[PDB]
UniProtKB/Swiss-Prot annotation, chain A:
It comes from the Eukaryota. It comes from Homo sapiens. Polyubiquitinated; which leads to proteasomal degradation. The N-terminus is necessary and sufficient for nuclear envelope targeting. This is Sentrin-specific protease 2. The active site is at H112, D129, S182 (nucleophile). Binds to SUMO2 and SUMO3. Interacts with the C-terminal domain of NUP153 via its N-terminus. Interacts with MTA1. The chain holds residues 367 to 589 of 589 of the full protein. The gene is SENP2. Belongs to the peptidase C48 family. Protease that catalyzes two essential functions in the SUMO pathway. The first is the hydrolysis of an alpha-linked peptide bond at the C-terminal end of the small ubiquitin-like modifier (SUMO) propeptides, SUMO1, SUMO2 and SUMO3 leading to the mature form of the proteins. The second is the deconjugation of SUMO1, SUMO2 and SUMO3 from targeted proteins, by cleaving an epsilon-linked peptide bond between the C-terminal glycine of the mature SUMO and the lysine epsilon-amino group of the target protein. May down-regulate CTNNB1 levels and thereby modulate the Wnt pathway. Residues 30-194 are annotated as: Protease. It is found in: Nucleus, Nuclear pore complex; Nucleus membrane; Cytoplasm.
UniProtKB/Swiss-Prot annotation, chain B:
This is Small ubiquitin-related modifier 3. The keyword DNA damage does not apply. It comes from Homo sapiens (Human). Residues 1-78 form the Ubiquitin-like domain. Changing I19A: Impaired interaction with USP25. The chain holds residues 15 to 95 of 103 of the full protein. There is a cross-link at G78 (Glycyl lysine isopeptide (Gly-Lys) (interchain with K-? in acceptor proteins)). Covalently attached to a number of proteins. Interacts with BMAL1. Interacts with USP25 (via ts SIM domain); the interaction sumoylates USP25 and inhibits its ubiquitin hydrolyzing activity. Interacts with SAE2 and UBE2I. The keyword Cytoplasm applies. The lineage of its organism: Eukaryota, Metazoa, Chordata, Craniata, Vertebrata. GO terms for cellular component: cytoplasm; kinetochore; nucleoplasm; nucleus; PML body. Keywords: Cytoplasm, Isopeptide bond, Nucleus, Ubl conjugation, Ubl conjugation pathway. The gene is SUMO3.
Length: 223, 81
């Protein structure tokens, strides 16, 4: 499924060369060779690669007719947890969250990547983690955020009684078996959940996924 | 004309700047790095959660007086402790 020229192109992007060389530009982001290399085996993905891919999921969904998706920046959560609604209020200029269906919130833990899914169509939150960490409290903060967004942007409070939030069972969602693919799991969780697809991948696919993601980023086209 | 932007880092610092609404923000960003002892590669300038390009201008981004530009450090991740 990966042409010999696709591989030759991926190999070229991951190979030797200056850090700063820009290899793909879109969404006001500039993915340099240094960013792309975090996609090498055993390497830790950075915010640039994740925000970029997340932006691709939104575009892909619009093009292939999947649910209206909205993705927050990897910087949103930390900013929220530290300055509350006021610090992130304007981060939604001219876009009504509630006109969306699936909302993705990437979550950066000091040295680990995580994902929160807000399904407006079912009014339920879900925390996804490849290393089984807990996130009940993260969803609470996010839900409170929605409430404040609703009252502040469309003068009407959410009926919290309708929303429900369940943390995913380590035996339901695939877990990572090593020490460096949490960023990858986060992106692939988001990918499958954006398409309402059962998360059926395993740690075994990660290497190919990594290879494919560099091609997908350079070509700004998913596979 | 002249506008005043505030650059706020994650460490609680705030740096005041004065620029014309039609000046590309490049010089401001570069100056910020120099003063704060930061490296462009490792940080991220954001205006209301959106990234800023050196070629962007306060006008093109519709910035008002006393508006704030946020600065973030890079994030990396593989496994938790």
């Amino acid at each position: 499924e990966l042409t010999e020229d696709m591989e030759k192109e991926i190999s070229n992007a991951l190979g030797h060369g200056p850090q700063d060389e820009i290899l793909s530009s879109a969404f006001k982001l500039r993915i340099t060779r240094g960013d792309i290399q975090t996609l090498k085996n055993y390497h830790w993905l950075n915010d640039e690669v994740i925000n970029f891919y997340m932006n691709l999921l939104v575009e892909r969904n619009k093009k292939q007719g999947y649910p209206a998706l909205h993705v927050f920046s990897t910087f949103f959560y930390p900013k929220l947890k530290s300055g509350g609604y006021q610090a992130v209020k304007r981060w939604t200029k001219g876009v009504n969250l509630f006109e969306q269906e699936i909302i993705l919130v990437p979550i950066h833990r000091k040295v680990h990547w995580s994902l929160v899914v807000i399904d407006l169509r079912k009014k339920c939150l879900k925390y996804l983690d490849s290393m089984g960490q807990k996130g009940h409290r993260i969803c609470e903060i996010l839900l409170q955020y929605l409430q404040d967004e609703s009252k502040t942007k469309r003068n009407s409070d959410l009926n919290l009684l309708e929303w429900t939030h369940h943390s995913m069972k380590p035996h339901e969602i695939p877990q990572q078996l090593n020490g460096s693919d949490s960023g990858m799991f986060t992106c692939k969780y988001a990918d499958y959940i954006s398409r309402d697809k059962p998360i059926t991948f395993t740690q075994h696919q990660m290497p190919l996924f990594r290879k494919k993601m560099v091609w997908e980023i350079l070509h700004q086209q998913l596979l | 004309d002249h506008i005043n932007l505030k650059v706020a880092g994650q460490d609680g610092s705030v740096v005041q700047f004065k620029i014309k609404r039609h000046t590309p923000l490049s010089k401001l960003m570069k100056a910020y790095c120099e003063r704060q002892g930061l490296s462009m590669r490792q940080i991220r300038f954001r205006f209301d959660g959106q990234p800023i390009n050196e070629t962007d201008t306060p006008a093109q981004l519709e910035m008002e007086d006393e508006d704030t530009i946020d600065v973030f450090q890079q994030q990396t991740g593989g496994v938790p402790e």
